[PDB]
Amino acid sequence: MVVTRIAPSPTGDPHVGTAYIALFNYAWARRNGGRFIVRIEDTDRARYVPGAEERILAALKWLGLSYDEGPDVAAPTGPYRQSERLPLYQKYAEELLKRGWAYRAFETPEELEQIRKEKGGYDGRARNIPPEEAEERARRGEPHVIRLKVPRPGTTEVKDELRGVVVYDNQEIPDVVLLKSDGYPTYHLANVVDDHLMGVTDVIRAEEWLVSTPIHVLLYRAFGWEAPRFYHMPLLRNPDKTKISKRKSHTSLDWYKAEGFLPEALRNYLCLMGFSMPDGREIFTLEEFIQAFTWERVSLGGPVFDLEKLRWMNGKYIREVLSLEEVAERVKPFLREAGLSWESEAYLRRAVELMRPRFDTLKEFPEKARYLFTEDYPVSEKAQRKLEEGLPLLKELYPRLRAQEEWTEAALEALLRGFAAEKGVKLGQVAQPLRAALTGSLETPGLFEILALLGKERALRRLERALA
Template sequence: MASKDTEPVRTRIAPSPTGEPHIGNMYVALVDWAFARQRGGQFIVRIEDTDRSRLLEGAEEMFLESLRWLGLDYDEGPDVVGPVGPYRQSERTDIYREHAERLIESGHAYRCFCTPERLKEIRDERQKSGEATGYDRRCRAIDPDEVKRRMEAGEPHTVRLAVPLEGETQFTDGLRGPIVIENQRIDDQVLLKSDGYPTYHLANVVDDHLMGVTHVIRAEEWITSTPKHVLLYEAFGWEPPRFYHLPLIRNPDRSKLSKRKNPTNVLWYREQGYLAEAVVNFLGMLGHSMPDGREVFTLDEFREAFSWERVTTTGPIFDMEKFEWL
């Protein structure tokens, strides 16, 4: 068996088409692309469009157009036929439901009949007492016969992950090293919503496995979700990929990058006459340094020089003055 350092590499960028293509997503996409291309691997695009209430018409095409403009070619995606499609999660709902049933049958998930009103009461009570606002696991103890009766009656329900009540879950972040969390601190996450659509957590893990993703490279905001994902990999009996969580881009005042303080729509820069090469150059300097210290380089030069050892875990600053200099 090939080691993880020599195996074929498959990375992915998985945007939700709920807004304009964000500069932060392109920063992550650039790293995904560079690492895959440097290792002779594949870079794929998956559209995570299961949150139907927040979809923005045209957002998917704007994201793909941003990738094309920056030169980040992809091997598979919603408009590039590949062997593990479809590449829109809204077209894969049967796959997620099937896997949710597998988890229930193996005892790693359960059906939850709690109403939104009851969940709000739990949340409010726990907030008042200063407790963590997770679910109280009430439905985890329901008798199987009662579950069957309530399902036959058509009672709305979700499917939740049955997190082990003891022990701990750990994983290694490629930038930060080992991360360990006690299982009692992990919420019984909803995996399948009452409308039959999956949450990010179930769809993400199932798709990354079925699509052969070897390295999950994403923003650091997903670190706290990764223990849940590791538990899902274990529940399915799958080997997890390697995880790398990139620091969030910050405004000069260290606040999270937002369009109120800096233009965050990638295509805005094209409309204003900026060259794609300049945008790539700027993104390539965010959190990564070239071995010879230079600040002007091409996309191919960034790909050749990319190294995890030169990626910082400190949030890079979005400096428009430096951008203008480029």
């Protein structure tokens, strides 16, 4: 059938580049009613970040991607932690050895540095060791690596399903170490082993590993077994067209989540990174994507991640895709975080309704509608100026408000319009100073809803302090 995967490396914060690839493997897989696996690349006992695996998988769920097999979501094909299958790589490496496709090397790291120094990179000198000698030194527990024995005089054909066939000159292909000294393998060794053993048919990965593919087709050759299809996604870039960097832009998914970004939005944004809907529609769901997916719709340029457009998307989602109920729910965590609290669900909802078009990130909500949840809100100069400037006619109005029985957006609007009229003045002239008295902002939703929402007592009392 069709089997795609993601081999994430638990060596840092959950990367957005990881989501990018994941999103496309999930799509292709689902699009073909095939399987999609998660394989953890944890065979670097040096750059391993403990607690980094959980985060990656949680991050993947957060965006809405479900995988058919993986570390938590078990499966039929062996452990999904590259670390739990070291013995495998072991045997397969030995396999190539006692097969003429690999050889043991013993050069210490420094000698290699020297080898690389005096001459490009390693020169496969270890290829000159008699198998028995190498075998012996190995038996005597002498430290060494197991490098791929590339047929030096030759050429290797690679085929990107998106770019076509890219013939290579073995001269360009090194005898890459497969099994490291510590007995641990390299992406090269474990990817082909696990990809095949797990039955992956389509390898969708970052363009980053394009050039490394000829090593893989070679390995698939040595083991004597069918190569999968290869698709290389273009690398996401920093504003400076360079592949996304942690210090040139936010690459941590935990940051996006923290900054009040909707997973659905980020995911939808991610889709636009290469793929595009026939009808040019920019907003759609995960399923519509897995459904409209076609490699003939994938662009190959390097896309620059635009936080601006992302923000725009998050706002759009908040105001058109999610329901009021949905927003009011997601907004709470940010409320609690900002120290604010809401009186009731009803209150919160209406508060969220009036703000819906005024924030593009959940974080932005408790920020701009703070006065809606606490007495401890700031007062802008412009606001103070507008308040002081209108305090008089405000006093000339307070009694009317301390009187008005029908505390309704409709009613309140009538009184105020009447007021401004009877005072030979333009609405805004009464509305703004009041707005500033109530919110201390001058940048606020409608006056009548603000007036109303708070409630007669609540509203007047506050406006009283302002006039105080």
